[PDB]
Amino acid sequence: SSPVWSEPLYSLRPEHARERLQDDSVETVTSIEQAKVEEKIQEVFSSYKFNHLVPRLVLQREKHFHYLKRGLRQLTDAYECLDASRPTLCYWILHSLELLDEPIPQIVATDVCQFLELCQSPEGGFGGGPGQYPHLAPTYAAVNALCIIGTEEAYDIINREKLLQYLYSLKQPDGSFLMHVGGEVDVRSAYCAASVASLTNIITPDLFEGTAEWIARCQNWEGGIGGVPGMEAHGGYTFCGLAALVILKRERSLNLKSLLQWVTSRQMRFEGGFQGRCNKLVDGCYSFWQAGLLPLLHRALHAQGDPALSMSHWMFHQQALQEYILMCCQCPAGGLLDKPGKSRDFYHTCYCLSGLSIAQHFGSGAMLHDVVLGVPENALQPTHPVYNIGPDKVIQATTYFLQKPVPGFE
Amino acid sequence: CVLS
């Protein structure tokens, strides 16, 4: 085989050049943009090859850590556009640190808890900042952040009685949920609601009545899921849809065959990463939204007794995704991003890392099989495919809240 | 990439 200091890469194989776009001599905006990205990516790939010498890939953990540590405390005015998503920023940063196995000082943990408490609304749920109306996005993020901290102090911050009332206040008769009072409706809400309701043990038999059916209506001719019935299949909305159904134990409401074929088709043959929609560009954040669907589908099919399922790999190219993330999505100054040429941000840092962890770790039943590309130190902590926080954090939180009654219900 |  190869010496330990050289590791052959899929993206560097000579035959990999055959995977370049074939535009059939018919140019459109779509093919032109795709070709431009592939050209840049090939240049990047080649920079990691020195003829037969191919040094192991390195995740710049320390650089990422310092960037995250600073962001958790202060942000430049460049983030004014996210002033209504602060609990969300907290989650992105904390989950990134969690994946990197970077401890959270007790003081920082308490400060986060106090801040999220200030974001909690008297009517239930959390807003994008102190005094803001509650919204399912920051609510989902706040709950996840508190669970990552995992202390009784963090858990108890959540006003469970009002949270359940708040979810009821957003529930529509057709099974869908508004993102906030007087707000828009799409599959993101069903996932946010299912996520926080299941973690905090506040699910009632009627809360999600009709929700599974509404989500199934969102799956389209492509096999993927759109934001609302009729819309184009999209990785973000598909993750939300399937994850919510898994929580509701209603995955069978979907055509899992067309969904599986659709998501696997979203991995780019040349880049190795995933696109959000068919015929659109690769993007590091879809490393999670799309790739995260494979562990969910694996579980779904496994529950059905599928005898053909792998006992060692997810149904996507785990190595290629790792190659795309490690070679193309790291900012030398720390942080991760969409693709070469784009600037870093905490959102991409969170999801590029989340996707990398999914690609490195396979687990099913009593079987565990890791594939950590590059130096061993690249190994990230595992992440739960449904909630996207540590599996340990999920178990600890669910066990804690299961000891509490469902607010005003039996 | 806006989520909300």
Place this chain on the structure above:
Amino acid sequence: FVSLDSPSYVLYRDRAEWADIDPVPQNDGPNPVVQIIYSDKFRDVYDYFRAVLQRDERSERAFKLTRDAIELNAANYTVWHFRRVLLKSLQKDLHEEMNYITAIIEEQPKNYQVWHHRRVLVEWLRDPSQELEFIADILNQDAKNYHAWQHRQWVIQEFKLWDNELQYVDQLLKEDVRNNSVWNQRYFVISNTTGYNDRAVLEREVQYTLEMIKLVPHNESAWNYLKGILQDRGLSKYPNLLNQLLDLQPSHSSPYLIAFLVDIYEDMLENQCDNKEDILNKALELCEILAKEKDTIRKEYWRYIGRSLQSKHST
């Protein structure tokens, strides 16, 4: 009146007409986290927004203030909600507000709040007369804007404006036949008008799609649409399609065509086709070709399909 970037703009803390109300600072706690270092102008507007919101002041000055708050952060849904409360309380001219949201969306077309606000206005007015044209302009700038397409489907379905959408679809497909959002709109229009059960309509669509495939063999959208309109009844229910694809294979053995053949074989085996052993063998051979050479990025998927086929039809 005056915009945030206008030379004569004055901070709210310096406006005489606002002197009677005390600004309300944001309480982030003594030891802040994810603390944004706001500009003086940003904080000024929001300190006063918090004041009017806290006092629930349904006034014209409050209404004008939300405009600046929105320019500073159009993603602040709390401001948008309050602005709508004011629109009703003050009985503001909704057509004037439509012109406002039109300009706002043009500036920030990928924002959730602006499109929802527009939908609310259209619902309040029950006036969709400007929608299709406005949306077309947004799509002329970004033909794949998700929010634009979503709003377009809502308007068409809610106000029954189906008459010219297929023509619009054909127009955009001519501009970029690889635009997946347009192929989706195509399915949206047909399934909601004639439906696909009309065999004349289905044949028209299959013919059209095959022609697009011949023009651009590696455009995945057309292949996905072809499978999309035939999958529910079953790919094996269309015997002539298999023959036609097999004839094009030798000259167009793209991974899309090869994968489509496997999809057909899968369905055939699922419907007690004749020559089961032969079909299974052909399907397994293609799965290997896809996994090892033609579609290696999906090696695990194709290996899975190979094993699935054997678990279901070996005998």
